[PDB]
Amino acid sequence: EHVILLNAQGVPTGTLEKYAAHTADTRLHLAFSSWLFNAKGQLLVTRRALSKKAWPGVWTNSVCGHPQLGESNEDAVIRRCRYELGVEITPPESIYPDFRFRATDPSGIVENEVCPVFAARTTSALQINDDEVMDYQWCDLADVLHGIDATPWAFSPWMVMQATNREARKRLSAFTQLKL
Amino acid sequence: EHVILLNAQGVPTGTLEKYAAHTADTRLHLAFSSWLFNAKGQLLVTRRALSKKAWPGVWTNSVCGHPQLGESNEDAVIRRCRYELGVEITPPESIYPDFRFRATDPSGIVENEVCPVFAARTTSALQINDDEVMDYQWCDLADVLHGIDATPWAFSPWMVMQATNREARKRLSAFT
Numbered sequence: 001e002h003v004i005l006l007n008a009q010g011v012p013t014g015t016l017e018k019y020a021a022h023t024a025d026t027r028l029h030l031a032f033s034s035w036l037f038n039a040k041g042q043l044l045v046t047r048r049a050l051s052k053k054a055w056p057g058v059w060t061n062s063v064c065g066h067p068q069l070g071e072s073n074e075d076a077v078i079r080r081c082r083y084e085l086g087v088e089i090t091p092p093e094s095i096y097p098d099f100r101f102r103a104t105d106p107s108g109i110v111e112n113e114v115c116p117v118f119a120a121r122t123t124s125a126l127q128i129n130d131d132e133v134m135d136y137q138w139c140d141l142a143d144v145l146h147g148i149d150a151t152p153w154a155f156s157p158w159m160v161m162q163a164t165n166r167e168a169r170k171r172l173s174a175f176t177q178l179k180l
Numbered sequence: 181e182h183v184i185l186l187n188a189q190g191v192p193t194g195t196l197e198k199y200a201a202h203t204a205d206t207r208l209h210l211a212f213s214s215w216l217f218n219a220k221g222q223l224l225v226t227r228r229a230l231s232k233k234a235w236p237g238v239w240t241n242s243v244c245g246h247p248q249l250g251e252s253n254e255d256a257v258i259r260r261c262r263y264e265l266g267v268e269i270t271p272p273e274s275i276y277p278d279f280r281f282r283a284t285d286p287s288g289i290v291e292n293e294v295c296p297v298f299a300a301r302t303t304s305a306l307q308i309n310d311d312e313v314m315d316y317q318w319c320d321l322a323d324v325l326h327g328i329d330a331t332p333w334a335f336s337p338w339m340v341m342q343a344t345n346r347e348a349r350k351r352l353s354a355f356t
């Protein structure tokens with residue numbers, strides 16, 4: 001697996017081994033983040049496995065990853081949902097295409113990414129992948145947004161930043177409608 | 181270091197090495213939970229090191245531990261405050277004396293404890309033991325309670341049980 005390196009603009013310049021790319025001096029690369037809702041409109045919240053190199057054991061939104069060479073960001077979203085959560089989804093919607101984030105995790109690992117955000121509905125049961133996800137919960141979005149407001153330091157920083165973007169937040173809200 | 185096994189009633193009946201004691205089948209034993217506030221009235225919330233056997237990486241109340249044979253609850257608290265957080269504290273005060281619980285962590289490790297709950301104020305700066313704590317936050321109790329009320333899953337299960345105990349919540353709410 002690899003990440004796609006971006007120059008000091010969002011322009012691709014090559015690729016780099018995933019593990020080797022994420023260090024204390026991570027270079028800009030392409031990634032995605034997705035927010036998954038069940039038919040009932042509940043949000044799927046997940047907890048990263050203790051073996052994740054970056055933010056292990058942290059509560060975060062549904063699914064994040066790294067598109068590979070020749071992969072649309074949307075295909076990447078479909079793929080990691082399958083791999084991490086075993087789950088089938090509706091076409092991912094772009095809800096924050098310009099999100100960009102750089103940050104250091106509790107042990108020094110840096111994520112530095114161009115990270116378009118999507119939302120989608122699940123259309124199958126989950127088959128959680130324990131090497132990726134150690135715990136999860138189906139929640140009402142309102143509650144989650146209330147927890148993020150009260151104790152943001154208890155969740156991944158990128159979950160908080162995306163959730164507090166006004167336009168992104170309105171998209172999340174729309175997905176709380178019950179859909180059969 | 182050990183934990184103290186307790187029969188149905190809270191009678192000590194023997195001990196076990198501390199590491200060997202927490203398994204998928206953890207047996208009932210003695211413990212404590214403690215909530216610490218500084219002079220400004222802020223609550224210390226901590227995140228357990230990734231190496232802890234039970235609930236590693238989980239956000240929780242300030243300091244928890246296992247009294248040893250012959251040790252008072254108040255001394256255990258003082259001991260673990262010093263050990264985990266390098267902090268001196270005022271005499272621990274009772275806030276939930278009959279708390280008890282059993283729970284299972286994401287890897288299937290169980291805690292099963294008689295666990296009286298205390299509160300105290302810090303009288304020195306923290307000096308962190310990263311074998312025990314990987315992160316922490318000084319915050320307002322009120323916000324922490326909102327967090328616990330909104331997304332209980334984001335916190336340890338016993339933290340949630342304690343804070344939502346009507347009496348214990350009133351007593352913590354007075355440390356600010």
Ligand SMILES: *[C@](C)(CO)CCOP(=O)(O)OP(=O)(O)O
Nearest residue numbers: 031032033064065066111113158
């Ligand atoms: C950015 C959002 C990291 O915060 C993308 C990384 O997601 P991650 O799940 O860590 O990547 P994978 O390991 O490919 O799933």
Ligand SMILES: *[C@](C)(CO)CCOP(=O)(O)OP(=O)(O)O
Nearest residue numbers: 211212213244245246291293295
């Ligand atoms: C119960 C509340 C939690 O398992 C008491 C145990 O505290 P813990 O921090 O796990 O014990 P130590 O490892 O002795 O610090």
Ligand SMILES: [Mg+2]
Nearest residue numbers: 063064065080
């Ligand atoms: Mg991922």
Ligand SMILES: [Mg+2]
Nearest residue numbers: 243244245260
């Ligand atoms: Mg402890």
Ligand SMILES: [Mn+2]
Nearest residue numbers: 029031111113
């Ligand atoms: Mn990355």
Ligand SMILES: [Mn+2]
Nearest residue numbers: 211291292293
């Ligand atoms: Mn124990």
